[PDB]
């Protein structure tokens, strides 16, 4: 069994603002992590990442299709085994 997941990558403030906007779309995702970055990276702000999880791929699809994710942020998908 797997959990669809998503990484929003980009400037830290941009992700924080995007995260506030997700409040309008809570039905479209389950959990949003706080901002994190790779320890190897000193790259302040634009090396910030946020992970979101979903009930299903269908929910993930609806999320991507509905929520406005700016061009300044990179979206990657993946899964976690339950």
């Amino acid at each position: 069994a797997t959990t669809p997941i998503i990484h929003l990558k980009g400037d830290a403030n941009i992700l924080k603002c995007l995260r506030y906007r997700l409040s309008k779309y809570k039905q479209l995702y389950e959990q949003v992590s706080s901002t994190w970055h790779w320890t190897c990276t000193d790259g302040k702000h634009k090396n910030a990442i946020v992970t979101l999880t979903y009930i299903s791929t269908s929910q993930r699809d609806d999320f991507l299709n509905t929520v406005v994710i700016p061009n300044t942020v990179s979206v990657s998908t993946g899964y976690m085994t339950i």
Copy 2:
């Protein structure tokens, strides 16, 4: 194409110490994130998570088999599409 990933979940200090210990095993993983938690969670410390990425599943196997991950930490696996 996918990146094998790992979530170490547990108390925040325990993960921080584990992360210091990984310095002995840098060849066994690529990147370790800083500590993060789910925004829904107020659960201080034990709701802390750390993500690690790997060159391959083989490297992930070697990492799990070699590094001592305490029972206080939960390990889950997953992948991210490149």
